[PDB]
Amino acid sequence: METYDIAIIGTGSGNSILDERYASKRAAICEQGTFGGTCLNVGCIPTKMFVYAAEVAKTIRGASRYGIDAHIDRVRWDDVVSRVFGRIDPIALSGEDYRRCAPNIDVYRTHTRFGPVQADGRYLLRTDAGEEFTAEQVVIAAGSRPVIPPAILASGVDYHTSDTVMRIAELPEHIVIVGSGFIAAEFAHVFSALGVRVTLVIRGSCLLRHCDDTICERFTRIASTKWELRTHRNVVDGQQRGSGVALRLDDGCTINADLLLVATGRVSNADLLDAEQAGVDVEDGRVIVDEYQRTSARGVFALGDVSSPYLLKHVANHEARVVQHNLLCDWEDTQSMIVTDHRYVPAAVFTDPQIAAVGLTENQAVAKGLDISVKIQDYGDVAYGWAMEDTSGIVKLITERGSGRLLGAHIMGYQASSLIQPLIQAMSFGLTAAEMARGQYWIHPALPEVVENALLGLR
Amino acid sequence: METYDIAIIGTGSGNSILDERYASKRAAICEQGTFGGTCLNVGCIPTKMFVYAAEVAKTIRGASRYGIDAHIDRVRWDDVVSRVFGRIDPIALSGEDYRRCAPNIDVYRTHTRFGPVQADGRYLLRTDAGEEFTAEQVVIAAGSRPVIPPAILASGVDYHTSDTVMRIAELPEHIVIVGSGFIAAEFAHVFSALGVRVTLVIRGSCLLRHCDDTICERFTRIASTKWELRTHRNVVDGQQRGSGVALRLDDGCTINADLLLVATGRVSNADLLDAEQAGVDVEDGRVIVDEYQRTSARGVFALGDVSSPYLLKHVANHEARVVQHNLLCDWEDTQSMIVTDHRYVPAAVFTDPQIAAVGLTENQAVAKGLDISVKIQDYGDVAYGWAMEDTSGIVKLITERGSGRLLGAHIMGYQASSLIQPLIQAMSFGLTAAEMARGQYWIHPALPEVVENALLGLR
Ligand SMILES: Cc1cc2nc3c(=O)[nH]c(=O)nc-3n(C[C@H](O)[C@H](O)[C@H](O)COP(=O)(O)OP(=O)(O)OC[C@H]3O[C@@H](n4cnc5c(N)ncnc54)[C@H](O)[C@@H]3O)c2cc1C
Ligand SMILES: Cc1cc2nc3c(=O)[nH]c(=O)nc-3n(C[C@H](O)[C@H](O)[C@H](O)COP(=O)(O)OP(=O)(O)OC[C@H]3O[C@@H](n4cnc5c(N)ncnc54)[C@H](O)[C@@H]3O)c2cc1C
């Protein structure tokens, strides 16, 4: 049997752990899927590449509004996929060879499970290929996996997820997307801009429900005009109709479509770990971690979607930085460790219009009994919005009336993820709204003026 | 003669002075040109509207690179001008009626000059229409005016400036722009994107020279490939060629063109005031003001291009806010006034690629003997740059090695004026580079990751 000093399960954010501090130790890496993780191969990086291609097509269609008559001749979807994955797929191989060729790091490419803890304190790990090894410290970065509704699974129909829809041969004529999350909204923007008829079948009343109701209500109204929105509906059955699909809904109506995309959420991969056999406690479906990313087992850390409540890459990277430091630091030296901070976490949804938010919502501050001041500023009231002829873009700020500090920031409009950054800086470092408005300069007539005027308007 | 409490010369930024605190005094407004000023009618607002229209056309032309085959059918230049100025021109009428119809405000629409000071100490003002009146307090906001080379004026050739070139009937086939400032660079981007052949005749060696040399050198190289750049050349003579022009250069070569655009700089309007007859001192060609915007004459303030060294609207509005407060404040109570802030002034040039900068450049910090750290981060190294397939976007940061604070920030690329705002906030409030990188969250995979990596790369 082989002995290792540290074993990491998952090459997502856990790949960024073995640095030069581990040059004298023997490490083992486990990756049941493709090297690199989810974000690179089938996640954030390839999706936003398709989004920018969609944003190019959206500009051409609405060019007539500005005085330029243009039209799209062809959408070479085959070359778009080749351009996207021609950059990503070779990256996964280079990173895989960089770790495998290292003499002190050994890579296992099968599903690894937890075994009973050995007498000496070392953790036994077993792979689905039949490999057994031990490690003093163990890092859990198993991530998450998609969830498919049981009614869709029991139907036996051909469906697609975010993991497989990005490598399709030809663009369909009509697609049905089941879901209302950030994945479902971004894909609706991609296919619609490329010329596909999009139909959203959501079970709730608003798209992107966990956003502020002001944003969700305005965006759901705008989205309902460009896409076919079926609210309060659930898919109960379906059958093949050739290359397409025929799905029956909970109200008796049936929908014919060429492709079915399931985006009903994701849950952690902790259930396929046998963590109970090693002393790691699991609640709901996630791994229990503390402020030092320490689990209920001595020497075992965890990070990423497998434990964190935020399924975001910028959060998983902050937890990977905590694991890197709190590792080499004795298990009980909590004064010499670093605490993971989750205060003011931002998020963005790359749709049309783009949405980006950070902090509490208006109703969330009300539920906490805070005396708040709210201002909603439109893009069309700023000089840059005049050049854009914008008629829907907004930026919403919530501040505590007493302290004058920012409580929440919700933007829905052009360059939402970029204009939200100066607002993230004020919240993270404790800058009051009055200081952000008049304490610095804003270039005229740049776009961030809509954030400046929103602060001035906070009556 | 008419008695007034306050008289303001210039309805540009000076219009934002008359508040409800003066709702009982008799005020006089002077506007020799069109109401609203330079920025709205013939400046920033209409120019940046044409820029966005040009940026839309630029996206369609290079759309094939991303997999979308498109082409521009027609450029309705007449509808672009009508859409822009159909929105701007009525604003000048509404703002003009808003002041004239007020019983306490009287509007004079001719050029106003300074007269000899009256015996009682009040300032006499005379307009070119024959109106004489007096005022207790005077605000000078005369702005600036374009500068035309003497060789072009003595030639008798038909030339255009930023005040007149935007309302042309039909787009020319070939245009020549004489100048290297921010005005000349933005207009070269506008006409080139709309299909005009652009030829730059600059007197120096680099385009946008007063910017960081790293930016100027890279931008001048890019501009030389899409536009015809003739460096170290000056127009010495010219003659009409029909609807076009034939210009003679300082090296004997002649250029035939359809339109001539002059962007060789601007000069303050203080020289056309007879200001020495009222006791207000003039240096160079601008009015001398102190840190409280006070001139050398008791009761006389000044703001805008007529005095400030920075010819920017966001600076002229900050100076108008200081005048508005220190006006209503006793002339000798300097302890109860507000100081004009010129510490971290930003600027942007809306060209292709877009440029935005704030603070000192690398060569400026060297001349001051500061131990600095410099990092140049490429757009192509961030996840958003992959979706953009960017190959030229950069962000340059200069920090003091000792204090660790930001000394300068120079960006050349997509969303330059928007990406620089979080950097302006850190400099204006005293945030260190290490705090900006790891003290807050950056949305993945948003564009501001290039600013985060530029801070992380500093060593
Ligand atoms: C379509 C899509 C778009 C997204 N867009 C964004 C976005 O814009 N911004 C953002 O912040 N986040 C985004 N995310 C979320 C982001 O991708 C994840 O939150 C992030 O990848 C989680 O990192 P991780 O390393 O914990 O998970 P992963 O990167 O998935 O790491 C888990 C890896 O380990 C493997 N593994 C699991 N269990 C085992 C085992 N027992 N043995 C061996 N190997 C195992 C898995 O196969 C996988 O390769 C998106 C996700 C999706 C699906
Ligand atoms: C093409 C162009 C683009 C620009 N783009 C930008 C940009 O993107 N960002 C930016 O920050 N700045 C920009 N500027 C600069 C900006 O326009 C000025 O810095 C700002 O408008 C200064 O305001 P002001 O009120 O002092 O000048 P003005 O707005 O010109 O005010 C002066 C007004 O008073 C009148 N006047 C002058 N003298 C007299 C007199 N004796 N009697 C009566 N009336 C008089 C003038 O005719 C004029 O109408 C640009 C300028 C130009 C020309």
JSON list of N, CA and C in Angstrom, two decimals, chain A residues 109-164:
[
{"chain": "A", "resi": 109, "resn": "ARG", "atom": "N", "xyz": [-7.45, 8.99, -11.43]},
{"chain": "A", "resi": 109, "resn": "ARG", "atom": "CA", "xyz": [-8.49, 9.47, -12.34]},
{"chain": "A", "resi": 109, "resn": "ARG", "atom": "C", "xyz": [-9.78, 8.67, -12.22]},
{"chain": "A", "resi": 110, "resn": "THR", "atom": "N", "xyz": [-10.02, 8.07, -11.06]},
{"chain": "A", "resi": 110, "resn": "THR", "atom": "CA", "xyz": [-11.26, 7.34, -10.79]},
{"chain": "A", "resi": 110, "resn": "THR", "atom": "C", "xyz": [-11.91, 7.89, -9.53]},
{"chain": "A", "resi": 111, "resn": "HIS", "atom": "N", "xyz": [-13.18, 7.52, -9.34]},
{"chain": "A", "resi": 111, "resn": "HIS", "atom": "CA", "xyz": [-13.94, 7.99, -8.19]},
{"chain": "A", "resi": 111, "resn": "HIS", "atom": "C", "xyz": [-13.34, 7.45, -6.90]},
{"chain": "A", "resi": 112, "resn": "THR", "atom": "N", "xyz": [-13.02, 8.36, -5.98]},
{"chain": "A", "resi": 112, "resn": "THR", "atom": "CA", "xyz": [-12.37, 8.02, -4.72]},
{"chain": "A", "resi": 112, "resn": "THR", "atom": "C", "xyz": [-13.37, 8.11, -3.58]},
{"chain": "A", "resi": 113, "resn": "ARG", "atom": "N", "xyz": [-13.38, 7.10, -2.72]},
{"chain": "A", "resi": 113, "resn": "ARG", "atom": "CA", "xyz": [-14.27, 7.05, -1.57]},
{"chain": "A", "resi": 113, "resn": "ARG", "atom": "C", "xyz": [-13.45, 7.05, -0.29]},
{"chain": "A", "resi": 114, "resn": "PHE", "atom": "N", "xyz": [-14.10, 7.43, 0.81]},
{"chain": "A", "resi": 114, "resn": "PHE", "atom": "CA", "xyz": [-13.47, 7.44, 2.12]},
{"chain": "A", "resi": 114, "resn": "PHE", "atom": "C", "xyz": [-13.58, 6.06, 2.75]},
{"chain": "A", "resi": 115, "resn": "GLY", "atom": "N", "xyz": [-12.48, 5.60, 3.35]},
{"chain": "A", "resi": 115, "resn": "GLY", "atom": "CA", "xyz": [-12.47, 4.35, 4.06]},
{"chain": "A", "resi": 115, "resn": "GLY", "atom": "C", "xyz": [-12.44, 4.56, 5.55]},
{"chain": "A", "resi": 116, "resn": "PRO", "atom": "N", "xyz": [-12.47, 3.48, 6.32]},
{"chain": "A", "resi": 116, "resn": "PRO", "atom": "CA", "xyz": [-12.38, 3.61, 7.78]},
{"chain": "A", "resi": 116, "resn": "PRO", "atom": "C", "xyz": [-11.03, 4.16, 8.19]},
{"chain": "A", "resi": 117, "resn": "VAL", "atom": "N", "xyz": [-11.04, 5.05, 9.18]},
{"chain": "A", "resi": 117, "resn": "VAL", "atom": "CA", "xyz": [-9.79, 5.66, 9.63]},
{"chain": "A", "resi": 117, "resn": "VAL", "atom": "C", "xyz": [-8.88, 4.59, 10.22]},
{"chain": "A", "resi": 118, "resn": "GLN", "atom": "N", "xyz": [-7.61, 4.64, 9.84]},
{"chain": "A", "resi": 118, "resn": "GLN", "atom": "CA", "xyz": [-6.65, 3.66, 10.31]},
{"chain": "A", "resi": 118, "resn": "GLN", "atom": "C", "xyz": [-6.26, 3.93, 11.76]},
{"chain": "A", "resi": 119, "resn": "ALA", "atom": "N", "xyz": [-5.61, 2.93, 12.37]},
{"chain": "A", "resi": 119, "resn": "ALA", "atom": "CA", "xyz": [-5.25, 3.03, 13.78]},
{"chain": "A", "resi": 119, "resn": "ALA", "atom": "C", "xyz": [-4.24, 4.15, 14.02]},
{"chain": "A", "resi": 120, "resn": "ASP", "atom": "N", "xyz": [-3.28, 4.31, 13.11]},
{"chain": "A", "resi": 120, "resn": "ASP", "atom": "CA", "xyz": [-2.24, 5.33, 13.28]},
{"chain": "A", "resi": 120, "resn": "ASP", "atom": "C", "xyz": [-2.76, 6.75, 13.08]},
{"chain": "A", "resi": 121, "resn": "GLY", "atom": "N", "xyz": [-4.02, 6.91, 12.66]},
{"chain": "A", "resi": 121, "resn": "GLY", "atom": "CA", "xyz": [-4.58, 8.22, 12.43]},
{"chain": "A", "resi": 121, "resn": "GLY", "atom": "C", "xyz": [-4.65, 8.62, 10.97]},
{"chain": "A", "resi": 122, "resn": "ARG", "atom": "N", "xyz": [-4.07, 7.82, 10.08]},
{"chain": "A", "resi": 122, "resn": "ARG", "atom": "CA", "xyz": [-4.07, 8.13, 8.66]},
{"chain": "A", "resi": 122, "resn": "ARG", "atom": "C", "xyz": [-5.41, 7.74, 8.04]},
{"chain": "A", "resi": 123, "resn": "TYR", "atom": "N", "xyz": [-5.83, 8.51, 7.04]},
{"chain": "A", "resi": 123, "resn": "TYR", "atom": "CA", "xyz": [-7.12, 8.29, 6.40]},
{"chain": "A", "resi": 123, "resn": "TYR", "atom": "C", "xyz": [-6.93, 7.39, 5.19]},
{"chain": "A", "resi": 124, "resn": "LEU", "atom": "N", "xyz": [-7.72, 6.32, 5.12]},
{"chain": "A", "resi": 124, "resn": "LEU", "atom": "CA", "xyz": [-7.67, 5.40, 3.99]},
{"chain": "A", "resi": 124, "resn": "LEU", "atom": "C", "xyz": [-8.62, 5.88, 2.90]},
{"chain": "A", "resi": 125, "resn": "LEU", "atom": "N", "xyz": [-8.14, 5.87, 1.66]},
{"chain": "A", "resi": 125, "resn": "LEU", "atom": "CA", "xyz": [-8.93, 6.27, 0.51]},
{"chain": "A", "resi": 125, "resn": "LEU", "atom": "C", "xyz": [-8.93, 5.14, -0.51]},
{"chain": "A", "resi": 126, "resn": "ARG", "atom": "N", "xyz": [-10.10, 4.87, -1.08]},
{"chain": "A", "resi": 126, "resn": "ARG", "atom": "CA", "xyz": [-10.28, 3.78, -2.03]},
{"chain": "A", "resi": 126, "resn": "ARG", "atom": "C", "xyz": [-10.89, 4.34, -3.30]},
{"chain": "A", "resi": 127, "resn": "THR", "atom": "N", "xyz": [-10.29, 4.01, -4.44]},
{"chain": "A", "resi": 127, "resn": "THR", "atom": "CA", "xyz": [-10.79, 4.44, -5.74]},
{"chain": "A", "resi": 127, "resn": "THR", "atom": "C", "xyz": [-11.61, 3.32, -6.37]},
{"chain": "A", "resi": 128, "resn": "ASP", "atom": "N", "xyz": [-12.46, 3.71, -7.32]},
{"chain": "A", "resi": 128, "resn": "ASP", "atom": "CA", "xyz": [-13.31, 2.74, -8.00]},
{"chain": "A", "resi": 128, "resn": "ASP", "atom": "C", "xyz": [-12.52, 1.79, -8.88]},
{"chain": "A", "resi": 129, "resn": "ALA", "atom": "N", "xyz": [-11.25, 2.08, -9.16]},
{"chain": "A", "resi": 129, "resn": "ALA", "atom": "CA", "xyz": [-10.40, 1.20, -9.93]},
{"chain": "A", "resi": 129, "resn": "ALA", "atom": "C", "xyz": [-9.69, 0.15, -9.08]},
{"chain": "A", "resi": 130, "resn": "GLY", "atom": "N", "xyz": [-9.75, 0.27, -7.76]},
{"chain": "A", "resi": 130, "resn": "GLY", "atom": "CA", "xyz": [-9.10, -0.68, -6.88]},
{"chain": "A", "resi": 130, "resn": "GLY", "atom": "C", "xyz": [-7.82, -0.21, -6.22]},
{"chain": "A", "resi": 131, "resn": "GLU", "atom": "N", "xyz": [-7.60, 1.09, -6.10]},
{"chain": "A", "resi": 131, "resn": "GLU", "atom": "CA", "xyz": [-6.37, 1.63, -5.52]},
{"chain": "A", "resi": 131, "resn": "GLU", "atom": "C", "xyz": [-6.63, 2.10, -4.09]},
{"chain": "A", "resi": 132, "resn": "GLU", "atom": "N", "xyz": [-5.79, 1.65, -3.16]},
{"chain": "A", "resi": 132, "resn": "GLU", "atom": "CA", "xyz": [-5.88, 2.01, -1.76]},
{"chain": "A", "resi": 132, "resn": "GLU", "atom": "C", "xyz": [-4.63, 2.78, -1.35]},
{"chain": "A", "resi": 133, "resn": "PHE", "atom": "N", "xyz": [-4.82, 3.89, -0.64]},
{"chain": "A", "resi": 133, "resn": "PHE", "atom": "CA", "xyz": [-3.69, 4.68, -0.16]},
{"chain": "A", "resi": 133, "resn": "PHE", "atom": "C", "xyz": [-4.14, 5.47, 1.06]},
{"chain": "A", "resi": 134, "resn": "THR", "atom": "N", "xyz": [-3.16, 6.02, 1.77]},
{"chain": "A", "resi": 134, "resn": "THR", "atom": "CA", "xyz": [-3.39, 6.77, 2.99]},
{"chain": "A", "resi": 134, "resn": "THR", "atom": "C", "xyz": [-2.82, 8.18, 2.88]},
{"chain": "A", "resi": 135, "resn": "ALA", "atom": "N", "xyz": [-3.31, 9.07, 3.74]},
{"chain": "A", "resi": 135, "resn": "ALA", "atom": "CA", "xyz": [-2.85, 10.45, 3.77]},
{"chain": "A", "resi": 135, "resn": "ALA", "atom": "C", "xyz": [-3.04, 11.00, 5.17]},
{"chain": "A", "resi": 136, "resn": "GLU", "atom": "N", "xyz": [-2.11, 11.87, 5.58]},
{"chain": "A", "resi": 136, "resn": "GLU", "atom": "CA", "xyz": [-2.21, 12.50, 6.89]},
{"chain": "A", "resi": 136, "resn": "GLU", "atom": "C", "xyz": [-3.29, 13.58, 6.89]},
{"chain": "A", "resi": 137, "resn": "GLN", "atom": "N", "xyz": [-3.26, 14.45, 5.89]},
{"chain": "A", "resi": 137, "resn": "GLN", "atom": "CA", "xyz": [-4.26, 15.48, 5.71]},
{"chain": "A", "resi": 137, "resn": "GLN", "atom": "C", "xyz": [-5.03, 15.20, 4.42]},
{"chain": "A", "resi": 138, "resn": "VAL", "atom": "N", "xyz": [-6.32, 15.51, 4.43]},
{"chain": "A", "resi": 138, "resn": "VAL", "atom": "CA", "xyz": [-7.19, 15.25, 3.29]},
{"chain": "A", "resi": 138, "resn": "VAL", "atom": "C", "xyz": [-8.00, 16.51, 3.01]},
{"chain": "A", "resi": 139, "resn": "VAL", "atom": "N", "xyz": [-8.05, 16.91, 1.74]},
{"chain": "A", "resi": 139, "resn": "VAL", "atom": "CA", "xyz": [-8.80, 18.08, 1.30]},
{"chain": "A", "resi": 139, "resn": "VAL", "atom": "C", "xyz": [-9.94, 17.61, 0.40]},
{"chain": "A", "resi": 140, "resn": "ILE", "atom": "N", "xyz": [-11.16, 18.02, 0.73]},
{"chain": "A", "resi": 140, "resn": "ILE", "atom": "CA", "xyz": [-12.36, 17.62, 0.00]},
{"chain": "A", "resi": 140, "resn": "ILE", "atom": "C", "xyz": [-12.79, 18.78, -0.88]},
{"chain": "A", "resi": 141, "resn": "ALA", "atom": "N", "xyz": [-12.68, 18.60, -2.20]},
{"chain": "A", "resi": 141, "resn": "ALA", "atom": "CA", "xyz": [-13.13, 19.57, -3.19]},
{"chain": "A", "resi": 141, "resn": "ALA", "atom": "C", "xyz": [-13.96, 18.88, -4.26]},
{"chain": "A", "resi": 142, "resn": "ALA", "atom": "N", "xyz": [-14.94, 18.08, -3.83]},
{"chain": "A", "resi": 142, "resn": "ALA", "atom": "CA", "xyz": [-15.74, 17.28, -4.75]},
{"chain": "A", "resi": 142, "resn": "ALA", "atom": "C", "xyz": [-16.74, 18.10, -5.54]},
{"chain": "A", "resi": 143, "resn": "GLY", "atom": "N", "xyz": [-16.95, 19.37, -5.19]},
{"chain": "A", "resi": 143, "resn": "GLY", "atom": "CA", "xyz": [-17.85, 20.21, -5.95]},
{"chain": "A", "resi": 143, "resn": "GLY", "atom": "C", "xyz": [-19.31, 19.77, -5.84]},
{"chain": "A", "resi": 144, "resn": "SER", "atom": "N", "xyz": [-20.05, 19.99, -6.92]},
{"chain": "A", "resi": 144, "resn": "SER", "atom": "CA", "xyz": [-21.47, 19.69, -6.97]},
{"chain": "A", "resi": 144, "resn": "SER", "atom": "C", "xyz": [-21.79, 19.02, -8.30]},
{"chain": "A", "resi": 145, "resn": "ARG", "atom": "N", "xyz": [-23.04, 18.58, -8.43]},
{"chain": "A", "resi": 145, "resn": "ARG", "atom": "CA", "xyz": [-23.51, 17.90, -9.63]},
{"chain": "A", "resi": 145, "resn": "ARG", "atom": "C", "xyz": [-24.94, 18.33, -9.93]},
{"chain": "A", "resi": 146, "resn": "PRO", "atom": "N", "xyz": [-25.36, 18.28, -11.19]},
{"chain": "A", "resi": 146, "resn": "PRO", "atom": "CA", "xyz": [-26.70, 18.75, -11.55]},
{"chain": "A", "resi": 146, "resn": "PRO", "atom": "C", "xyz": [-27.79, 17.85, -10.99]},
{"chain": "A", "resi": 147, "resn": "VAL", "atom": "N", "xyz": [-28.97, 18.45, -10.81]},
{"chain": "A", "resi": 147, "resn": "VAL", "atom": "CA", "xyz": [-30.16, 17.76, -10.33]},
{"chain": "A", "resi": 147, "resn": "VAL", "atom": "C", "xyz": [-31.21, 17.77, -11.43]},
{"chain": "A", "resi": 148, "resn": "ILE", "atom": "N", "xyz": [-31.76, 16.60, -11.72]},
{"chain": "A", "resi": 148, "resn": "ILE", "atom": "CA", "xyz": [-32.78, 16.43, -12.75]},
{"chain": "A", "resi": 148, "resn": "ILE", "atom": "C", "xyz": [-34.10, 16.09, -12.05]},
{"chain": "A", "resi": 149, "resn": "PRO", "atom": "N", "xyz": [-35.21, 16.73, -12.42]},
{"chain": "A", "resi": 149, "resn": "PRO", "atom": "CA", "xyz": [-36.49, 16.43, -11.77]},
{"chain": "A", "resi": 149, "resn": "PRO", "atom": "C", "xyz": [-36.86, 14.97, -11.94]},
{"chain": "A", "resi": 150, "resn": "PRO", "atom": "N", "xyz": [-37.43, 14.34, -10.90]},
{"chain": "A", "resi": 150, "resn": "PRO", "atom": "CA", "xyz": [-37.75, 12.91, -11.01]},
{"chain": "A", "resi": 150, "resn": "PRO", "atom": "C", "xyz": [-38.77, 12.61, -12.10]},
{"chain": "A", "resi": 151, "resn": "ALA", "atom": "N", "xyz": [-39.68, 13.53, -12.38]},
{"chain": "A", "resi": 151, "resn": "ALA", "atom": "CA", "xyz": [-40.66, 13.31, -13.44]},
{"chain": "A", "resi": 151, "resn": "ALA", "atom": "C", "xyz": [-39.99, 13.26, -14.81]},
{"chain": "A", "resi": 152, "resn": "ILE", "atom": "N", "xyz": [-38.95, 14.07, -15.01]},
{"chain": "A", "resi": 152, "resn": "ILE", "atom": "CA", "xyz": [-38.23, 14.05, -16.28]},
{"chain": "A", "resi": 152, "resn": "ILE", "atom": "C", "xyz": [-37.40, 12.78, -16.41]},
{"chain": "A", "resi": 153, "resn": "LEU", "atom": "N", "xyz": [-36.78, 12.35, -15.31]},
{"chain": "A", "resi": 153, "resn": "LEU", "atom": "CA", "xyz": [-35.98, 11.13, -15.34]},
{"chain": "A", "resi": 153, "resn": "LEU", "atom": "C", "xyz": [-36.84, 9.90, -15.60]},
{"chain": "A", "resi": 154, "resn": "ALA", "atom": "N", "xyz": [-38.01, 9.83, -14.96]},
{"chain": "A", "resi": 154, "resn": "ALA", "atom": "CA", "xyz": [-38.89, 8.67, -15.12]},
{"chain": "A", "resi": 154, "resn": "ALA", "atom": "C", "xyz": [-39.52, 8.61, -16.50]},
{"chain": "A", "resi": 155, "resn": "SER", "atom": "N", "xyz": [-39.51, 9.71, -17.25]},
{"chain": "A", "resi": 155, "resn": "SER", "atom": "CA", "xyz": [-40.11, 9.71, -18.58]},
{"chain": "A", "resi": 155, "resn": "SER", "atom": "C", "xyz": [-39.21, 9.03, -19.61]},
{"chain": "A", "resi": 156, "resn": "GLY", "atom": "N", "xyz": [-37.90, 9.02, -19.37]},
{"chain": "A", "resi": 156, "resn": "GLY", "atom": "CA", "xyz": [-36.97, 8.43, -20.32]},
{"chain": "A", "resi": 156, "resn": "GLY", "atom": "C", "xyz": [-36.71, 9.28, -21.54]},
{"chain": "A", "resi": 157, "resn": "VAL", "atom": "N", "xyz": [-37.00, 10.57, -21.47]},
{"chain": "A", "resi": 157, "resn": "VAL", "atom": "CA", "xyz": [-36.81, 11.46, -22.61]},
{"chain": "A", "resi": 157, "resn": "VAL", "atom": "C", "xyz": [-35.36, 11.93, -22.66]},
{"chain": "A", "resi": 158, "resn": "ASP", "atom": "N", "xyz": [-34.92, 12.30, -23.86]},
{"chain": "A", "resi": 158, "resn": "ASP", "atom": "CA", "xyz": [-33.58, 12.83, -24.06]},
{"chain": "A", "resi": 158, "resn": "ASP", "atom": "C", "xyz": [-33.53, 14.28, -23.61]},
{"chain": "A", "resi": 159, "resn": "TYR", "atom": "N", "xyz": [-32.76, 14.56, -22.56]},
{"chain": "A", "resi": 159, "resn": "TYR", "atom": "CA", "xyz": [-32.62, 15.90, -22.02]},
{"chain": "A", "resi": 159, "resn": "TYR", "atom": "C", "xyz": [-31.16, 16.32, -22.02]},
{"chain": "A", "resi": 160, "resn": "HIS", "atom": "N", "xyz": [-30.94, 17.62, -21.83]},
{"chain": "A", "resi": 160, "resn": "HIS", "atom": "CA", "xyz": [-29.61, 18.20, -21.79]},
{"chain": "A", "resi": 160, "resn": "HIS", "atom": "C", "xyz": [-29.44, 19.00, -20.51]},
{"chain": "A", "resi": 161, "resn": "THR", "atom": "N", "xyz": [-28.20, 19.09, -20.05]},
{"chain": "A", "resi": 161, "resn": "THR", "atom": "CA", "xyz": [-27.83, 19.90, -18.89]},
{"chain": "A", "resi": 161, "resn": "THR", "atom": "C", "xyz": [-26.75, 20.90, -19.29]},
{"chain": "A", "resi": 162, "resn": "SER", "atom": "N", "xyz": [-26.30, 21.69, -18.31]},
{"chain": "A", "resi": 162, "resn": "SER", "atom": "CA", "xyz": [-25.22, 22.64, -18.56]},
{"chain": "A", "resi": 162, "resn": "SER", "atom": "C", "xyz": [-23.91, 21.95, -18.90]},
{"chain": "A", "resi": 163, "resn": "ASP", "atom": "N", "xyz": [-23.77, 20.66, -18.57]},
{"chain": "A", "resi": 163, "resn": "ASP", "atom": "CA", "xyz": [-22.53, 19.93, -18.84]},
{"chain": "A", "resi": 163, "resn": "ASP", "atom": "C", "xyz": [-22.42, 19.47, -20.28]},
{"chain": "A", "resi": 164, "resn": "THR", "atom": "N", "xyz": [-23.53, 19.32, -21.00]},
{"chain": "A", "resi": 164, "resn": "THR", "atom": "CA", "xyz": [-23.53, 18.73, -22.33]},
{"chain": "A", "resi": 164, "resn": "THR", "atom": "C", "xyz": [-24.09, 19.64, -23.42]}
]
